[PDB]
């Protein structure tokens, strides 16, 4: 009978079911494709082909009709199909979508908008069934996406192309190219890319345009750049030459980065930025605002007693208002960006800020996977932030979980529920394996190197609660056998899920997390022996206690010398507590 609205990501701002839904016919009437966004139509064409829906040559009135276009197209048949709903009054990138009575209309506020309308369309359709809905939709934050700016092995060409498809499909519109260990990015920033790297860039730029992603070409010259006299000219001209050869392949966004360098010449940094902004960005006329990150880029390094440090004050005083400025929040890697930290930094800079969010990056603690949702970022952040990017792992595939939630948070910020988003991320990504992937991933959300880097939702918090309850019940001598049995089940379940993931994950995921799958299976076995210890102590069975103690020490020993790190404060720490 009725067609339910499937999982959608991001969450559309306004959605109403207006009917029972309908099945889309074998072949459809497509209207508006001549004037509609070229990329939206290609996206739509691929989806139709992938789902064996043909486009009729000649209108057949017995077939589903799909109308598509932007506000600024003169197509009356579209305005008739929206039934008084419009994208005219929406912010840029917004769209309206209506399916009723065998018609699907999509109207983008602009081309980006029409492409995004197609994305939502694609998510709504299952086995030819679409619900009947009226949608108007638009992003909270106008720049949303990813900065590949981590240390360690950069993503491959194949990784990047696949990521860019993934951004498109989740309405992320920004990808900043800035890998720390690309030599031509940083170590040898003056040197041109060779012919073949330039060909790989071209493919990246093309795929970005195809997927409505702003490819941002970053460069980090702060290691050895000269600011004064003829050397300053020469080194500035090296920036221009480099940026120009990416402009010449189609790049329209640029970033100059000053993070993690010894030189703290604020004014000279800001002068390089302003000169480039005048001589390059504005001169070109079709280039987006310049992006930067200052040498002090977290609040702790930027601010001292409510008042900016020397560097920051001078940088902010000099850096042209049009330039986007990124900061990571209260620390490099931190639990939170409270609304007040944003207010503070946006105060000093006197502009809306850009966030460089260092999660799920794991270059500072490579043994663990960061597989949680966006967590700790205030839902009113849009008031001081208009540009949002996450720094992912050197593992592109598994970064997808966290990035999926980044798409939800930055598109529809105030509706964002990290737990619901996290569940949706895994459901949409893992299909048949979702429920198991959740069991595993649930243990791998918290990042903590025990010093400066701490971020993420806590590892399996419900399980910790039960573990904590068990210790309370034992020390106050209450009957724990209901909890005990419950706990055997959870540990068994961790083992069963992990063994199923190992057998069934496709290679692309499996090769990113197989060591951590072994780790969690190990720990689950040690948690089980840990309980066998508890029970033997209760039953005064020394034989059975010494025997479970050995097993529990043998699993803990394996985990402690593992490169893989998982569930430190939950599965791991339970064995330590029992010992």
């Amino acid at each position: 009978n009725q067609v339910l609205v499937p999982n959608l990501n991001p969450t559309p701002e306004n959605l109403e079911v207006v009917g029972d839904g309908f099945k889309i016919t074998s072949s459809i009437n497509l209207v508006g494709e001549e004037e509609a966004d070229e990329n939206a139509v290609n996206a739509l064409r691929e989806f139709l082909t992938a789902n064996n829906i043909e486009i009729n040559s000649e209108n057949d009135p017995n077939s589903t009709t799909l109308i598509i276009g932007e506000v600024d197209d003169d197509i009356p048949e579209l305005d008739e199909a929206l039934n008084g709903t419009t994208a005219e009054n929406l912010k840029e990138e917004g769209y309206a979508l209506v399916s009723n009575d065998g018609k699907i209309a999509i109207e983008g506020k602009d081309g980006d908008g029409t492409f995004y309308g197609v994305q939502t369309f694609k998510q709504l359709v299952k086995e030819s069934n679409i619900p009947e809905v009226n949608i108007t939709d638009y992003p909270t934050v106008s720049a949303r996406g990813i900065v590949e700016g981590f240390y360690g092995t950069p993503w491959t060409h194949q990784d990047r192309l696949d990521q860019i498809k993934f951004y498109g499909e989740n309405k992320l519109n920004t990808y900043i190219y800035a890998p720390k260990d690309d030599p031509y990015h940083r170590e040898k920033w003056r040197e041109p890319y060779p012919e073949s790297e330039m060909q790989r860039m071209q493919e990246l730029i093309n795929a970005s345009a195809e997927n409505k992603v702003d490819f941002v070409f970053g460069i980090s010259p702060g290691i050895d750049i000269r600011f004064d006299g003829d050397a300053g000219e020469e080194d500035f001209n090296h920036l221009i030459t480099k940026a120009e050869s990416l402009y010449d392949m189609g790049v329209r966004s640029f970033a100059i980065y000053w993070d993690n360098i010894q030189d703290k010449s604020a004014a000279k940094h800001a002068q390089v930025l302003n000169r480039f902004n005048e001589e390059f960005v504005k001169a070109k006329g079709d280039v987006k605002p310049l992006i930067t990150v200052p040498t002090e880029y977290d609040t702790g390094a930027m601010v001292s007693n409510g008042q900016p440090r020397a560097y920051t004050r001078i940088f902010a005083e000099t850096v042209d208002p049009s330039i986007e400025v990124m900061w990571t929040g209260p620390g490099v890697v931190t639990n939170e960006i409270p609304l007040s930290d944003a207010q503070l930094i946006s105060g000093i800079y006197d502009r809306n800020m850009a966030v460089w969010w260092n999660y799920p990056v794991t270059d500072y603690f490579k043994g663990k996977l960061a597989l949680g949702p966006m967590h700790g970022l205030d839902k009113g952040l849009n008031q001081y932030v208009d540009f949002f990017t996450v720094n992912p792992m050197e593992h592109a595939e598994l970064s997808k979980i966290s990035i999926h939630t980044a798409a939800d948070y930055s598109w529809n910020m105030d509706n964002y529920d990290y737990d619901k988003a996290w569940n949706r991320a895994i459901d949409m990504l893992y299909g048949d394996l979702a429920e198991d992937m959740k069991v595993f991933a649930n243990h791998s959300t918290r990042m903590d190197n025990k010093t400066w880097a701490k971020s993420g939702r806590e590892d399996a918090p419900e399980l910790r609660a039960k573990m904590d309850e068990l210790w309370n019940k034992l020390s106050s001598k209450e009957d724990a056998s209901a909890l005990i049995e419950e706990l055997y089940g959870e540990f068994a379940r961790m083992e069963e899920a992990c063994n199923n993931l190992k057998a069934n994950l496709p290679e692309v995921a499996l090769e990113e997390c197989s060591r951590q799958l072994d780790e969690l299976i190990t720990l689950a076995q040690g948690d089980k022996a840990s309980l066998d210890m508890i029970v033997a102590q209760l039953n005064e069975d020394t034989e059975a206690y010494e025997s479970a103690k050995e097993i529990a020490q043998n699993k803990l020993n394996t985990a402690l010398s593992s490169f893989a790190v998982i569930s430190e404060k939950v599965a791991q720490s339970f064995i330590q507590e029992a010992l």
């Binding site: 240390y151 360690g152 720390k180 260990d181 993070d259 993690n260 490099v332 890697v333 260092n358 270059d363 500072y364 010093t451 400066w452 880097a453």
Partner: peptide, 5 residues
């Protein structure tokens, strides 16, 4: 150092 410390 291959991280931000």
């Amino acid at each position: 150092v291959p991280y931000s410390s």
